[PDB]
Each structure stands twice: as C-alpha cells, then as structure tokens.
C-alpha cells in the first residue's frame, strides 16, 4: 500500500509534468499534503505489473485506450462526480472513459497527430503521400530531406495504414467485437507497403525514432515531421518557422489517426482516494490548473469547456481537431494492449525487411 497523506502521480515524460508539479504545489499550500510527479519509462506497462506488490501511484495518467485493461484486472477505483461536475466537461470525453457502464477515470484532453512542416523550406506542404518521394529527391539536392517521424511506435504510422481500410476492432451495436480484426485487409496492406517502399528507396530510415526525428526537424535538417501538440514547445525554443496542418491523403482518402483522450485514474489500493478526487476536480481540471500544464507542453483540446473556448482560437488547435474529425477514437477494451503488441511487431518487421507486408500483417495475431 502507498503511504497515506501524500499523492504520487505517474505521467509520461513527453508531457508537461513540470507544469503538473506546480499544480501539485498549489495543492500542498492549501492542504499541507505533498504531491510528487514521476515519469517512469513504459509506465503504461509497469502499472499492472507492480500492482500486485502494492507499489504504483495513487493517480495514473495515460490515454483512455489502456484503462479498460486496468479496470478488468481490478486495479482502478470507480469515480463518483456529481451531475454538476460532469456538465463542465464535453459529453463525448466522458464516453471515452466509460467501461462496462461505469466511469473509471477523469478525462483531461484530446490528442491527435498533425502534419508539421518548415515554412521556409516548404511554403506549400504536399497534399498527398504520393508526391513525397518526388519532393524528397528535390530536397536531397539541397542537403535536406522531406519527412522524418518516429517509426518505432505504430501510433505514428497507423494514420497511413488506416487511410484506405485498416481498423482495429469492429464497432457495432454500441460494442466492440474482438473477433473482427481489420489489420491485414487490402487497405492496411496498401498503406504499410507504401511506407516500406519509402524506406527501400532511401527516402526514410527504418531506424528513425522519436529523438532522431525531433532533432532533425528542430535543427532545420528535414522539411516535415508528424507529431502531437506536446511537441510544439520544443519547436518554439528552436525558433524554427513551422506550421501545423492536415495530414496528406493516400489514394485519394485522408489519413485516419487514432484519437486519444488523456485521462487520470485512481488506484484501487490507494488510501488517498479522498484527496486525489479533490485534486483532479478542483485543482487540475480548472482554468488555472490546465493552463499551468498546457504552458509547459500543450495538452491539445482540453475536456473542460470553460477553457476550450480560448484554446480553439489557436490555428494549431483547429488543425489538431480537423485531423481528429477525420480519424476515430480508440477503443478502451482490455484487448487493446495485445493489439498494440502485435501491430508494433508487424510494422518493425516489415520496415526492416525481415518480413514482407503480407507476412507481417498475417503474423499480427491479437485474437
């Protein structure tokens, strides 16, 4: 069991945790209870692993897609906010955190990938994936490249795979059917085949990850990248003149990225459910709290209505939502963890030439 009289929080390292830590400081000056913020690596996997030993945080921060597994494993406490509080957040954001008819975390913000480009190197970004190979060879003649993004996580390549037919679990009757997986249909094979061709023709590099892609774009070495709102702060300090726009189309169809809702859950083994509930509702989910976190690393479109009216006026926010409107909200069923394991393995194997596209997508067994 975690110690009583203190709140331990887990949040990913790419988010503005220093801003969240400041929000925890205002909490202690009012209540006298310290708040510690940590960013462990692969925290979305360590939480169900360390739960049996009594460790883990009091509050866990992650996108909504992995919270159904935590609930089915019996690791989350059911939240109970009154009707007046639920009216403060958008209705659809509460749906993302509803599992088996119960609320299992507090929604925070909406995330979606966008296209980021260098205005000086590229005044008009391309509208289609198909013209990127021709644009790369023209930029290579100047010592630059067209596009670099994190190929090690299937979150970043899924928009192209799902562009012409790929999907995770079929949704129907208000429920997901785990026996209907759409990872190896004709559209998914076409999307991944196009990605592999870019690497084979030396337009991209199979070993590119998050840090390499972020450094190349921020240092003016590549013209385009794909990332989320949290990455905007690092581009600002590099004074690069950048834009945020819709992703290019593939075979005439738009890219369909998976939309995530950042959420905060409460540990079932925690004796501080009392304080964690008040911290989330009346200190973080306010105009002051969300702004302290957003000004560290942007959160995206927040779930709190009385703040989104301000953030919506940002063109970068409008671009995030237009990609989100063309995509779909991730499922929250427990099988999503096994889904991401199979898809991550298939993309890496195909991108490195160890398997063909037909072999990798057939090998992705999630049911």
């Amino acid at each position, epitope marked *: 069991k975690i110690e009583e009289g203190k709140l331990v929080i887990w949040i990913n390292g790419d988010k503005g945790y220093n801003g969240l830590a400041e929000v925890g400081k205002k909490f202690e000056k009012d209540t006298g209870i310290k708040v510690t913020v940590e960013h462990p690596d692969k925290l979305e*996997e360590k939480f*169900p*692993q360390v739960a*049996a*030993t009594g460790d883990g945080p009091d509050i866990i921060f992650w996108a909504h897609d992995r919270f159904g*597994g935590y609930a*089915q*494993s019996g690791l989350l406490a059911e939240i109970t906010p009154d009707k007046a509080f639920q009216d403060k957040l958008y209705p659809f954001t509460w749906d993302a955190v509803r599992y088996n008819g119960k609320l299992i975390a507090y929604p925070i913000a909406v995330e979606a990938l966008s296209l980021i480009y260098n205005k000086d190197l590229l005044p008009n970004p391309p509208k289609t994936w198909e013209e990127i190979p021709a644009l790369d060879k023209e930029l290579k003649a100047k010592g630059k490249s067209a596009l670099m993004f994190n190929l090690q996580e299937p979150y970043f390549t899924w928009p192209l795979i799902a562009a012409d037919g790929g999907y995770a679990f079929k949704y129907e009757n208000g429920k997901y059917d785990i026996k209907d997986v759409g990872v190896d249909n004709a559209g998914a094979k076409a999307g991944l085949t196009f990605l592999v061709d870019l690497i084979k023709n030396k337009h991209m590099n199979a070993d590119t990850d998050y840090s390499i892609a972020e450094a190349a774009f921020n240092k003016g070495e590549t013209a385009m990248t794909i990332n989320g709102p949290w990455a905007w702060s690092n581009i600002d300090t590099s004074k690069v003149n950048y834009g945020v726009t819709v992703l290019p189309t593939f075979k005439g169809q738009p890219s369909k990225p998976f939309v995530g809702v950042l959420s905060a859950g409460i540990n079932a083994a925690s004796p501080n459910k009392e304080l964690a509930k008040e911290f989330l509702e009346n200190y973080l989910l306010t105009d002051e709290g969300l702004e302290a976190v957003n000004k560290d690393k942007p959160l995206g479109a927040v779930a709190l209505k009385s703040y989104e009216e301000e953030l919506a006026k940002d063109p970068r926010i409008a671009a995030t939502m237009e990609n989100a409107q063309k995509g779909e909200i991730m499922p929250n069923i*427990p*099988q999503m*963890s*096994a889904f991401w*394991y*199979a898809v991550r*393995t298939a993309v890496i*194997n195909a991108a490195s030439g*160890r*398997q*063909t596209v037909d*072999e990798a997508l*057939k*090998d*992705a*067994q*999630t*049911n």
Partner: antibody, heavy 127, light 110 residues
C-alpha cells in the same frame, strides 16, 4: 542467486497411486507472481503441465493431465504444490517448477517467459 | 488448442569463435511470443531471449534473436566454450498451450 526454487516430493509409486510435489520460493513472493510445472523424461524434450496465478485467480492444465493433477499455492508459506493422482507409467520424468515474473492476464500474455527454474525432482511410476 | 514447434537443424558442429544460427517454426501465427532457453546435461533450463528478440538480463550480447519470414532465429555471433549446449524455443501466445520445440544440439568440432 537470491531468487531460487527448491522442489521436493518425488519418488516411486504404483500405477494408480498418488504423489504431492512442493516448490518453495525464496527471494520473491509467489502471491505477486506465477508458478509453472514442466517435466522432462530422460533424454527428451520439455512439456508444460500446469500453471497458477494467485493475484488473478488463474489456473490452467495441459490436456494430458486434466482430471488427474491439481495445482495450488500457499501464500502464507510461499510454497506451491502439484497433487498428482491416477499416475501412469508414462508420467515418469523429472518435474521442474518455474517462475513467471508477473501475475497472468490473457490481455497481458506478451510480458515474457519463465526466468527462474528449480533443480527438479524425479518421479517414477512402476509396478 | 493445437500447435507444433519444429527446430532446425537438430544438431550442428562448430568451433570456438564461429557464428551460429538456429531456426524455429510454429504451425500457427503467434506474433512474436516466442522465447529461447539453454540447457546443459544435468541442469535446469535457463532463459536467454523472450519476445523473439529481447535479451534477458545477464545474457551476453553475443546472443541475439530475430525473424526470418515466419521463422524465428537465434544467433551466437562469437561462440564461446560455455555456449555449447542444447537450445529450445517456446511459444506462449494465450490462444495456444505452452509448447516447446524438440531442441537443437550444438557440439564442439574437432
């Protein structure tokens, strides 16, 4: 070194007899892990028998031992057991107990394999 | 609830310092839920690789795992005297029971 498993309970019995094996753990807690039983006949390969996961209340058995073997765990003394009833001559083998580091859930199957094994105990079923 | 694990070759002879590669094939798709073990005569198995290519702590970096088509592969880049033993593959995808391969013997060549 600090994590180890010590088995006990093997011997020779008649066809139809019973035996009970033990697997005592040190360096970790069985209640927060998974224990497996794997057997090996002289000069052959490995075959999985049974599995238990205390924290998730999960048990599983191989088809060749269903209705005859029973796996259980005593958390208060950090020991797992394998009750073997209706033994046949073809059950003669060395029996191992191995650890899976975390509790078991079907949607979390991908966390790895068996990282620690015991020394084993010999079981002979003959008339 | 049926699956078969087949290893090739069943035996190979090599010298200290050689590079060696063993292959394993499953009769059903199981993603990369395959592990590799080492066993010497009179001793219990020892875990080397899991998730097809993740090296377990303490295993020297001269071991490595990868994929070749649908097959699983295990490679020892610089064979050492302690590396001579029998190697097994094992699948643990939740849709099929835990199943081992028939093993592969690595003997010293003289």
């Amino acid at each position: 070194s600090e994590v180890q498993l010590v088995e006990s309970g093997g011997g020779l019995v008649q066809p139809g007899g019973s035996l009970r094996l033990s697997c005592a753990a040190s360096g970790f807690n069985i209640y927060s892990s998974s224990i497996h039983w794997v057997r090996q006949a002289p000069g052959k390969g490995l075959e999985w028998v049974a599995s238990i996961s205390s924290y998730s209340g999960y048990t599983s058995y191989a088809d060749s031992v269903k209705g005859r073997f029973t796996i259980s765990a005593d958390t208060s003394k950090n020991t797992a057991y394998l009750q073997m009833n209706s033994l046949r001559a073809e059950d003669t083998a060395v029996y191992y107990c191995a650890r899976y580091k975390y509790p078991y859930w079907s949607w979390y199957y991908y966390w790895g394999g068996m990282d620690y094994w015991g020394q084993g105990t010999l079981v002979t079923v003959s008339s | 609830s049926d699956i078969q694990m087949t290893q090739s070759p069943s035996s190979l002879s090599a010298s200290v310092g050689d590079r060696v590669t063993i292959t394993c094939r499953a009769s059903q798709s199981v993603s990369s839920a395959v592990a590799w073990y080492q066993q010497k005569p009179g001793k219990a198995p020892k875990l080397l690789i899991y998730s097809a290519s993740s090296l377990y702590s303490g295993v020297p970096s001269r071991f490595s795992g990868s994929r070749s088509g649908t097959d699983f592969t295990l490679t020892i880049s610089s064979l050492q005297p302690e590396d001579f033993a029998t190697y097994y593959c094992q699948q643990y995808y939740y849709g099929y029971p835990i199943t081992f391969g028939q093993g592969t013997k690595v003997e010293i060549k003289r």
